[PDB]
Amino acid sequence: DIIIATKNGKVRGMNLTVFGGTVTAFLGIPYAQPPLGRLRFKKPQSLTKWSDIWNATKYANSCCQNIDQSFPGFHGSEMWNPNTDLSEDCLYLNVWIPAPKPKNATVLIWIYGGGFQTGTSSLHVYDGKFLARVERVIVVSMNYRVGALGFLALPGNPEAPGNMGLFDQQLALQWVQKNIAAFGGNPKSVTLFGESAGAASVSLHLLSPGSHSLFTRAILQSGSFNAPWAVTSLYEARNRTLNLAKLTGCSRENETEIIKCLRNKDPQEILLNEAFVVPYGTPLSVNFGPTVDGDFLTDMPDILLELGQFKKTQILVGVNKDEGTAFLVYGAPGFSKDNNSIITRKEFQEGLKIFFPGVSEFGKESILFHYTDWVDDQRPENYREALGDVVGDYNFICPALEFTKKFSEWGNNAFFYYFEHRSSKLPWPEWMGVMHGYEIEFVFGLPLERRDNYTKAEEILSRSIVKRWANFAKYGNPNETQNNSTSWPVFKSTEQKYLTLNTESTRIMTKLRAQQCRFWTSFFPKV
Ligand SMILES: *C1O[C@H](CO[C@@H]2O[C@@H](C)[C@@H](O)[C@@H](O)[C@@H]2O)[C@@H](O[C@@H]2O[C@H](CO)[C@@H](O)[C@H](O)[C@H]2NC(C)=O)[C@H](O)[C@H]1NC(C)=O
Ligand SMILES: *[C@@H]1O[C@H](CO[C@@H]2O[C@@H](C)[C@@H](O)[C@@H](O)[C@@H]2O)[C@@H](O[C@@H]2O[C@H](CO)[C@@H](O)[C@H](O)[C@H]2NC(C)=O)[C@H](O)[C@H]1NC(C)=O
Ligand SMILES: *[C@@H]1O[C@H](CO[C@H]2O[C@@H](C)[C@@H](O)[C@@H](O)[C@@H]2O)[C@@H](O[C@@H]2O[C@H](CO)[C@@H](O)[C@H](O)[C@H]2NC(C)=O)[C@H](O)[C@H]1NC(C)=O
Ligand SMILES: COCCN(C[C@@H]1CCCN(Cc2ccccc2)C1)S(=O)(=O)c1ccc2ccccc2c1
Ligand SMILES: *[C@@H]1O[C@H](CO)[C@@H](O[C@@H]2O[C@H](CO)[C@@H](O)[C@H](O)[C@H]2NC(C)=O)[C@H](O)[C@H]1NC(C)=O
Ligand SMILES: *[C@@H]1O[C@H](CO)[C@@H](O[C@@H]2O[C@H](CO)[C@@H](O)[C@H](O)[C@H]2NC(C)=O)[C@H](O)[C@H]1NC(C)=O
Ligand SMILES: *[C@@H]1O[C@H](CO)[C@@H](O[C@H]2O[C@H](CO)[C@@H](O)[C@H](O)[C@H]2NC(C)=O)[C@H](O)[C@H]1NC(C)=O
Ligand SMILES: *[C@H]1O[C@H](CO)[C@@H](O)[C@H](O)[C@H]1NC(C)=O
Ligand SMILES: [Cl-]
Ligand SMILES: [Cl-]
Numbered sequence: 276d277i278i279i280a281t282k283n284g285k286v287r288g289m290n291l292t293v294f295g296g297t298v299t300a301f302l303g304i305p306y307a308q309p310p311l312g313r314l315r316f317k318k319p320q321s322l323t324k325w326s327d328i329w330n331a332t333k334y335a336n337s338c339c340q341n342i343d344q345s346f347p348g349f350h351g352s353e354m355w356n357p358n359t360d361l362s363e364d365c366l367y368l369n370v371w372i373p374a375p376k377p378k379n380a381t382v383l384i385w386i387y388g389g390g391f392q393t394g395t396s397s398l399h400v401y402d403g404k405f406l407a408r409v410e411r412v413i414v415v416s417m418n419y420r421v422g423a424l425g426f427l428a429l430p431g432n433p434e435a436p437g438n439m440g441l442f443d444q445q446l447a448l449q450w451v452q453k454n455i456a457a458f459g460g461n462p463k464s465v466t467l468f469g470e471s472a473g474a475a476s477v478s479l480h481l482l483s484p485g486s487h488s489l490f491t492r493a494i495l496q497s498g499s500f501n502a503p504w505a506v507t508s509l510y511e512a513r514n515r516t517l518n519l520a521k522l523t524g525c526s527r528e529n530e531t532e533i534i535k536c537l538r539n540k541d542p543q544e545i546l547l548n549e550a551f552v553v554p555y556g557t558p559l560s561v562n563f564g565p566t567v568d569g570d571f572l573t574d575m576p577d578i579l580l581e582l583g584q585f586k587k588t589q590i591l592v593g594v595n596k597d598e599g600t601a602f603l604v605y606g607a608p609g610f611s612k613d614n615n616s617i618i619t620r621k622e623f624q625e626g627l628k629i630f631f632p633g634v635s636e637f638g639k640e641s642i643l644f645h646y647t648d649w650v651d652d653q654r655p656e657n658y659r660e661a662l663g664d665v666v667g668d669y670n671f672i673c674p675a676l677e678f679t680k681k682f683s684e685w686g687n688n689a690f691f692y693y694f695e696h697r698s699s700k701l702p703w704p705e706w707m708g709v710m711h712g713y714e715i716e717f718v719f720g721l722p723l724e725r726r727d728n729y730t731k732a733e734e735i736l737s738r739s740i741v742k743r744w745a746n747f748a749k750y751g752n753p754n755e756t757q758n759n760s761t762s763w764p765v766f767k768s769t770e771q772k773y774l775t776l777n778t779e780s781t782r783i784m785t786k787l788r789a790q791q792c793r794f795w796t797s798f799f800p801k802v
Contacts, residue, residue: 281454284325289332290374293408294723297374300404301458302397303335306417306450307366307443315538316427316435319366319446334359334397335367338420339542341392341549345605346612351702355712357395363424363542368417368447369396370458371403377411377459381466381749382451384490385416386444388471388498388712391564392422392549400712405720409738410745413460415451419443423519423545426563427537428512434534437512437568441483444476445571448489465490466748468591470715472564474498475505478678481585483571492751494591494744496718497598497671497711499678500576504559504670508575512566515552522548555632558605559670580678583685589751591744592679592766593692593773597708599667602630604707607662615706616659623658630666638802645794659706664791669799671711673792680768690753691766691773693787699730714776718744732778740776 277288277299291298307319314320337357346352373380385401387394396416403414419425419440428437452462467477467490474495480486481493482500500506507515516533520526523544525536537545549562556562567575579585603610607626609618618626627639634642646661676691683689694714697705701713716722722729722737729737739755743763747753753763761781764772771786 278328279457281457283322283454284327284329286329286331288372291404293404296408298404298407299372299374299376301331301370301372302333303367304329304331304370305335305366306368306447309364310366310420310439311363313538315363315424316439316534317433318436318439318442321446331370334369335418336360336362336365337395337397338365338418339363339424339546340389340394340421341546343393349612349702351612354400355389355393355398357393357397358399359395359397365418365420366443366446367396368415368450369403370455371407371414372458372460373407373411373413377413379461379464380411380413380459381464381745382413382415382455382460382462383466383468383745383748384448384451385414386419386467386469386473386476387416388469388473388475389421390504390559391426391440391472391561394421394472400716400719400721402719402721405723406741406745409720409723409741412745412748413455413458415447415455417444417447419447423549423563424542426512426565427516427519428507428563428566428568429516429530429534430509430513430566430568432530432534434531435516435537436570437566438571441476441479441565441571444480445483445486445489448480448486452489463491464749466492466494468494468496468718468744468748469498470496470712471498472505472561475500475502475565479565479572479576481588481590481682482576482579484573485571487586492589492748494747495593495675495678496714497594497675499592499675500565501580501678502670502674504561505565506576507561507564507566509567512563515562518552519545519548522551557630557632558602558607559630559666580681585682585685587685587687589688589690589747590679590682591690591692591747591753592675593694593776594672594675595709595711595714596693596695597663597667598671598711599663599665600707601703601711602666602670603663610659612704612707615656615704617655618658618662620658623662626662627665635802638799641798641802645791656706663708668788668791669795672788673795676771676787676792677796679766680771683766684768688751689766690747690763691771691787693773693775693784695775695777696733696736699733700728730778736776736778739781
């Protein structure tokens, strides 16, 4: 039998045959009390015990969330939709262990993204058996509440204080600290890693004092808290809570009555109203996400980062070459995943209004000016490409770079990557390039599965990324080998060196997109 004793009871695993070896998987370990009934909107409560041997042999329920149904049958979007029953009873986690069982393995904890409204640990691109098999690390991933059920905020009120999903993550980090040694793992070697909102989440755990001792090191893939979508101000969050009460028939004299009313609502009644809590939106809208709750976050995160009030440790940060394109076919006029999406200069300008609703006309004018200095005047795909880069630079690349600069300025080693390979199996059209989220499958080592129809070059690339991530986790240094390996230099605010990741060559380069990002940090805010 495959049985591990944990502080909350014994749990039964299952064997996976991986690359002619065995990985032991414990899928769907509860780590918190089910946030049902009176526990809805509260911080997660510690788990006491489950009754008998818990069978962690199938993934757990995913947290409640609206589904992306924009493209029925399309793998490109359905690969992100939850693949287990949705339920409010979702606070579970997964643990993959190398066989034979390690004595003190480094632990990698995955935090999925999904704009704080979606995601689940059970997606196939987050399958952790490959990393455990190939690098002999332990992999943990957890489900955390998303949407209003996860980030409804009445700051100061324990009935709905804000940042519950972040606290879900945190409680799972505490569970690893309490229990991972029984799975053979080193609680003193724990690396958080995640993508998009998960990366924004990792970046917020660097700032949260309660998480300081729950992990060693941090990997931020295509995301950071200073991205414009990631953190809502204290009273912007409160306002949206009130509007949800309004929209559901739960407006009440005092706040606890409002929360009382919202606990009576069906989950679908909450989920289907989440989109209407803001006056206007964008394809990158986070209606209920992290906020300044005074508990998980004691000040605006921008300030804590400025003042060095964060966990002093090593980080690995990076972005993808076409972060913006994904969001274009979700509300930008003239953009379809089924044509080559050539757009006019007028369609570009309409896209700016879609993605920048509350920005002045001269604000849009200067965005347009900064992104039209064409190398070749036509080149009929200039505006199509300009709009992607605007969305990608403003929402992801430039914030990730600025976070890395300011963080490295306080003395810890920081490593930046620019991932430029488009997957041979990427189901979206070619014009969308190296999309948001499509480095993940390489990080988790799926190209290592030869029966899966990736190219040999993608196996080598994924094998190299898998080595660097695991080496970063074990050693604070994302090295590959000492010899025959391009060195990954530290990111330093003067030189700002980064490593490119693709199949042709991995080069050290400097000041990624500095001319574009300089616009977004030092001019656009003044507008
Ligand atoms: C806080 O937010 C409200 C927005 O409230 C609205 O009502 C909700 C039910 C929801 O459906 C939203 O889409 C609505 O926008 C701000 O009030 C606005 O002013 C009036 C008051 O109802 C409303 O008709 C307007 O549409 C809102 N403004 C815009 C630009 O749409 C309110 O000002 C915000 N700030 C504070 C401090 O409360
Ligand atoms: C977890 O599953 C066990 C049974 O699953 C199997 O039995 C194990 C001994 C092992 O051989 C596994 O590989 C099998 O998949 C549940 O066990 C109870 O006890 C016996 C076990 O065979 C069974 O006849 C009983 O009917 C089970 N009890 C009940 C009330 O039906 C065990 O209950 C499962 N754990 C939980 C928390 O449900
Ligand atoms: C040592 O291995 C190289 C490949 O190693 C490349 O990996 C990158 C991450 C980076 O660190 C880089 O400096 C490093 O060189 C081998 O070259 C590969 O060789 C095959 C042929 O066997 C070519 O088809 C590949 O294109 C080539 N990859 C490259 C150049 O990136 C090579 O076998 C070996 N070189 C020596 C001198 O021993
Ligand atoms: C179901 O509820 C709708 C809300 N969003 C739907 C999104 C819209 C855009 C993309 N996809 C994911 C996707 C598709 C294809 C390739 C890669 C990635 C579906 S969301 O909750 O998922 C969302 C919101 C705001 C984000 C802000 C920053 C980054 C990601 C965000 C995701
Ligand atoms: C689950 O995987 C473990 C690890 O591979 C298996 O345990 C091994 O089985 C072989 C075959 O007899 C032994 O030589 C090893 O000594 C075993 N290891 C341990 C730690 O006991 C186990 O058999 C698998 N469970 C299954 C297949 O149900
Ligand atoms: C990558 O670099 C790190 C150093 O940054 C190497 O780490 C040492 O690793 C060995 C394991 O072989 C440990 O026993 C030492 O204690 C480590 N020392 C230090 C100072 O880190 C690591 O070996 C390198 N790996 C490769 C493949 O190059
Ligand atoms: C696993 O590795 C840790 C270190 O990462 C070992 O911890 C001990 O040694 C550490 C020095 O690096 C310190 O944290 C402590 O001196 C000590 N830990 C204590 C006393 O709690 C740990 O022993 C290793 N576990 C193994 C090998 O099973
Ligand atoms: C493709 O996308 C939509 C079709 O649904 C359309 O509005 C747009 O103009 C089309 N662009 C083409 C065909 O170039
Ligand atoms: Cl995502
Ligand atoms: Cl093209």
